[PDB]
Structure formats: structure tokens, C-alpha cells
Paper text:
Crystals of the longer NHLRC2 fragment (aa 1–572) diffracted to 2.7 Å and also belong to space group P21 but contain four protein molecules in the asymmetric unit. However, in each molecule the electron density for first 9 amino acid residues, the loop connecting the Trx-like domain and β-propeller domain (212–219) and the fragment between residues 345 and 354 were either missing or of insufficient quality to allow the chain tracing, suggesting flexibility of these regions. As expected from the sequence analysis, the structure of the longer NHLRC2 fragment can be clearly separated into two domains. Consistent with this the Trx-like domain of NHLRC2 displays the common features of a thioredoxin fold, containing a central mixed β-sheet surrounded by three α-helices, along with a Trx8 family specific 26 amino acid insertion comprising an extra β-strand and 2 short α-helices inserted after the second β-strand of the thioredoxin-fold. There are also two additional N-terminal α-helices which fold over the Trx-like domain of NHLRC2 in the crystal structure, forming an N-terminal protrusion.
NHLRC2 (NHL repeat containing protein 2) is an essential cytosolic protein of unknown function, mutation of which was recently identified in association with FINCA (fibrosis, neurodegeneration, cerebral angiomatosis) disease, a multi-organ condition which is fatal in early childhood. The N-terminal Trx-like domain contains a CCINC motif at the position of the CXXC motif, which is characteristic of oxidoreductases and commonly involved in thiol-disulfide exchange. The six-bladed β-propeller domain comprises six NHL repeats, a structural motif originally identified in genes NCL-1, HT2A and LIN-41 and shown to often function as a protein-protein interaction module.
Numbering used by the authors: 9 to 212, 219 to 344, 354 to 572
Write the structure that this text describes.
Amino acid sequence: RSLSGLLPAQTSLEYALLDAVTQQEKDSLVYQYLQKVDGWEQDLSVPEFPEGLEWLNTEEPISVYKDLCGKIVVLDFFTYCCINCIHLLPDLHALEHTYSDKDGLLIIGVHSAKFPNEKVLDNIKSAVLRYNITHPMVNDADASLWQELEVSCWPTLVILGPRGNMLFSLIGEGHKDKLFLYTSIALKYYKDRGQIRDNKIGIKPPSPLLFPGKVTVDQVTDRLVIADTGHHRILVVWKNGQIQYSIGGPNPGRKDGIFSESTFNSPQGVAIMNNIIYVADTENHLIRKIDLEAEKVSTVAGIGIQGTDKEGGAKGEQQPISSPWDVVFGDILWIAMAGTHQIWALLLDSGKLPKKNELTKGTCLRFAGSGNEENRNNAYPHKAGFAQPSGLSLASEDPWSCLFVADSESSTVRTVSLKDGAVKHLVGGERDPMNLFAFGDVDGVGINAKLQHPLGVTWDKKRNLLYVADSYNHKIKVVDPKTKNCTTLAGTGDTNNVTSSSFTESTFNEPGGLCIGENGELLYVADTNNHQIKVMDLETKMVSVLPIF
């Protein structure tokens, strides 16, 4: 009745596939595995989808035993917060392009939420558009199917035969070789038996910004750099809201050169200094450079594909990186490497980082984080762990001399010392370093405070405060790092949009990042799912929408 049933047989197949020298040997072994599993007396039948769950990218609900007979089916147990699930989506996209509904394959996303916020249908509907998921989707918010199957990992794939008989499970990310081997040979087998039908299954506004991930402010000239993630472009905008430069879009890409030529792929982090913007070009797995004087884009880090390198050390364009989410200047570029749960550095000029030797110009490496997904604090940077670090902010002045890290999957904020690299707790989470489920919405001191998937931090040098974009609680919070006291600055915690209002009566919706102005009078917020930049006046305590024209 559970995925336990496949484990002795499928691991016996996987042991043979490692001694298999030819692609034909591997194909015949998988075919022999399916002869065995198909000819079992008692199928490991999938539970039916619970009735009255909400479905996306379909006309009506889908049921395994009325609508998916005669089909190979890939269930994707996933949640949109998890970077491991995000990394899998390109592999499912490539599978759907290879094998249509007509060819006998359907993929179903069984959205099984980690966080409370992701249970809300409209927040899944946004995520579907953000990540461009064009296959059927079910909001299994209580995670009934997950708990019945004893799924234990985000993501889990479960491949079904034509009568809902479970054939394979693939746990986690980057099993593209096996996903293709298993589904291709599953189709081949059941087509040779004449059990795969060729029937169809039914599947299904120009604003100026579209899901803006991040924003930053030039200290000298008070211009905004907005990552307009959904339009796959960067905007340079004056303080009054007039657009100076639009760079990229409307389509994805990796193209360098002039600004009509240039293209990005869901950019998040942006930083600026001396007319040079660095972009964390997240789904390209690249750092890009925009030169505003020369009016040219170039690539400074990443090879263009998802790294699994946890150590690094190569020069820029020969160093694989994994889903860079935020960037800030330090002379160095600090990088929140969400994909490998680490803080990285690109050395813009040749220099030396805390607890390492001199490194040459262009060297791209890990600074902090083991690479394990953990809420682990440590005096030694390598032995500490992060959990999808998505925000940075530099406080270089004394007595801080630290990098503030929004650590999203842990629901904490972290300091990393710029003297000795010590990664220390600030607010949120629990003491247990393997506990990634210590989330909530509580104002308090240290571990007593609770956050929910925070994506942005910005440091106020004037007031000695940190503003946290506490994204899934739909709230800007304020942390005093001396006392470690964390409290709500603005946001009711609902998502019903409001243009002009006070801080306590204003609203946000999954704010992806934020940044303070030079003067310390304005706090700009990338209010992602409202498709808007929110300007918070810290003097009048009024929120306004930045007009863009």
C-alpha cells in the first residue's frame, strides 16, 4: 500500500544498472523489471485523488481510475518554496515536450505544501505563472496522498502504469537520466502489451511589472534597479518613477551585448555601484554585469547550467553556480547561493577573504555553508549550514562588521562576520540545526520570534535596524540586532491589495526583496505577487505605490 513496496525490487534494478556498460543492457534490465512488477498478483495501487481538491491547468478534476486509465503517469510531489522542486521543473518540462498526452504520458503536480501560505490556491496560481508550469496541478494542501504513500522528501516522483499500478519512485532532484529511462521503457512495455490509449486529456494582463523579485537603490544618485523577474528583464528607474533603461525581455535568454540584444532568465538579486549593476540571473545559473556608462551586458560567473559544486575556486565563467538569488557589493560581490545552501564570493578585484589565502581576480568560490540544507550556526564558516539563502545586506561599519542573511527554508535571519566568517543566529527558528519547520508569525527576542520563508533583508546604517521582508506572512518586520528583538513594521497579513495607507493598515503579497534609500527616509519593497514596488516612508509611516511610466 506504500512506496516501501517498490524498494527491495527497484534498488535491485538500480544495483544492476550501475554494472550495465551498454545503454541496451540498461534498457533490457528495466524491461525485465517491468515484466516482474506488471506480472505481480497484487498491484501497489495508487490511492485516488481526494474529492473536491482544487485543480489547475485542467477543465475539471482528474481521477486516476476514470481519466488516467491507458496512460503512464508521473506524479510530482512538490511545493513551490523548495529550490529542489524548482530545479526539477526543467526536467519535467523536457519530458512533457518529448511525450504528450497522445503518446501515453501525463505528468500531475501533486502540490503538497510545506508552509501554511502555500495552501492558499491563489498563491499556488501565482507560482504556476512565475515558474511556467503547463501540466495538471492538484492542491493537496493537507497532503493526504503524500501521507498515504509515505512520501518523505521534496520532490518525489512516482511513475504509474496504465491501471494506477506504482512502477518506480525517484526521490529528490537531478534524476533526469532515470526519469527518461523509466518513463520511456514504461511506455515501450505497455505499448507492446497494447494497454496505452492515444486519447487526449483536457488542459488549460499587460501590467508594467510582472512578479518583480527584487529591488535595490543607488546610494549616490537614488535611482532604483528593479529585477522584473516575470518579464525576464532589468529596469533602471529614476526616484520619481521614470524609466531610464529597460534591459531584457520579454522572453528568456542568456544573450550579452547591447541592451536591445540582451536577455535574462528570471533574474532576482540586483546590486549597483559606480554605474555597474551585477544581476543574479537565477534560472540561467549566471551572474551578469550591466555597464550603464558603456551600455553593454556581459557574463561574469556561471557556465549557464545548474552547478553541484559546493567548494568552487575556478575563475568566473569556468565556475558552475546554482540558483544565485541575491547579490551585494563588499572589492568583492557577495552571493546568496540558494541552490547549494551557501554564501559565495566573486572577487571583482584580486584580494583575500576572512580565513582564506590571497585569491586572483575573477575567482568564484564558497565562503560560508557546508552545502547541506541546515539551520546550523558555527564559528567556522565551512562547518555552518544555510537553507536556501535568498537575501543579503552588508553592514561593514563597527560594531557589526557582518553580512545579514535571510535564510528562507529555515525561517531565520543570520549574521556572517566579515572578520572571521562566523555564522551566528539573529532571529527566528529553533535550536535544532536539522529543524527546517520552525516557522510562524510571532514578534519576540531571538528564537522566540517566528518568520515564514523570509526572502529579503536590508540594513539601516542610520537607525542600526534590519528590515526583514517576511514574505509568506505578507509583512515587513524590523529587527534590532543588539537586543535581537523582532517586531512587525507594516502589513496586516492579508493579500487584498491597498495602494495608499498607514504601515499597520497596509498590505503586501509574497514580497521577494527590499532595500533602504541612502537618506534612510524610504524603504523600497518588491511586492512580487501584487506586480508593484511599494515605497514605505519611515518618517510619515505611509506606504505608497511607486508609479512606473
